[PDB]
Design a protein around this ligand. Structure first.
Ligand SMILES: CC(=O)N[C@@H]1[C@@H](O[C@@H]2O[C@@H](C)[C@@H](O)[C@@H](O)[C@@H]2O)[C@H](O[C@@H]2O[C@H](CO)[C@H](O)[C@H](O)[C@H]2O)[C@@H](CO)O[C@H]1O
Ligand SMILES: CC(=O)N[C@@H]1[C@@H](O[C@@H]2O[C@@H](C)[C@@H](O)[C@@H](O)[C@@H]2O)[C@H](O[C@@H]2O[C@H](CO)[C@H](O)[C@H](O)[C@H]2O)[C@@H](CO)O[C@H]1O
Ligand SMILES: CC(=O)N[C@@H]1[C@@H](O[C@@H]2O[C@@H](C)[C@@H](O)[C@@H](O)[C@@H]2O)[C@H](O[C@@H]2O[C@H](CO)[C@H](O)[C@H](O)[C@H]2O)[C@@H](CO)O[C@H]1O
Lengths: 89, 89, 89
């Protein structure tokens, strides 16, 4: 059937991030006020969810990428995507 | 199964729930005083949503997908309009 | 694959991740000091979530769908309870 998307935004410009899971891969499209562009996030998954929060001016994003029963947390804390501590336990 | 996406704002709060059911996305709304059916009505098998305030004014972006094609819908205070979002997918 | 939904609040932050797996939705929680399994447990194939603060108190709404039926679940400080949400008129 269809791709599966997740979205988050912040500020008043705004900034938007849209994550799309498509045939086992998640990609990211980004808006920061002046056109859509392809983001750095490129990781495996059939399903995606996202949440974000600001600490002052700094955006923090958590992307939950799932393949089968395995969910991997990916963390943006200003400069790159790092693996988070999340487990299903 | 049907598929949903939710957003909220303020502290009343206002809530918007989007449901993709048999190729149509509809919108249910809470503004503190009962659920009602909102103005949003667009095609899609999958839905995500994000929203942000600019002062007291809400801005909403809904991402509606069918197959690998995603269409953005914009609320900026005066009806739903098609957004600039693209994704090759 | 499993289907997830995430929400977060504050600046620590607190995070809740809902996972629909084999018809059941369960919850994992972060409050700054390790992931733990939350109280939430309801039926669903698909899940979305939103949350808002009233003072320091978190309010969470989880939209759980199976077939054509979506149920709203509410956290308001006193345990999970069924919400008034209905999908259609
Ligand atoms: C790998 C690890 O465990 N990192 C810790 C940070 O935890 C990450 O972020 C939190 C919110 C959850 O998503 C975790 O599952 C995830 O691993 C943790 O908290 C965060 O540190 C970030 C810098 O790494 C950043 O400062 C962020 O503001 C903060 O929320 C920190 C502090 O407890 O410890 C890391 O080890
Ligand atoms: C039935 C209808 O169309 N009512 C209008 C309100 O529209 C609803 O809410 C908006 C945000 C969309 O989700 C619509 O599709 C939905 O029908 C509309 O919205 C108001 O937004 C305020 C904040 O900017 C505030 O949260 C308020 O609770 C909400 O009602 C208003 C104002 O644009 O017009 C009504 O006609
Ligand atoms: C408001 C708050 O954060 N409450 C935490 C307890 O509940 C968790 O968080 C809330 C918002 C919901 O997401 C719940 O589903 C989630 O479990 C949390 O867990 C509760 O503690 C109880 C006794 O201390 C009891 O063990 C219960 O089973 C457990 O669900 C506790 C962690 O101990 O922190 C609260 O802050």
């Amino acid at each position: 059937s269809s791709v599966q998307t997740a979205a988050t935004s912040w500020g008043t410009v705004p900034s938007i991030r849209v994550y799309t899971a498509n045939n086992g891969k998640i990609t990211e499209r980004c808006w920061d006020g002046k056109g859509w562009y392809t983001g750095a996030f490129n990781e495996p998954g059939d399903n995606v969810s996202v949440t974000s929060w600001l600490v002052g001016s700094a955006i923090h994003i958590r992307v939950y990428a799932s393949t089968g029963t395995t969910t991997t947390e990916w963390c943006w804390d200003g400069n790159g995507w790092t693996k988070g501590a999340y487990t299903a336990t």
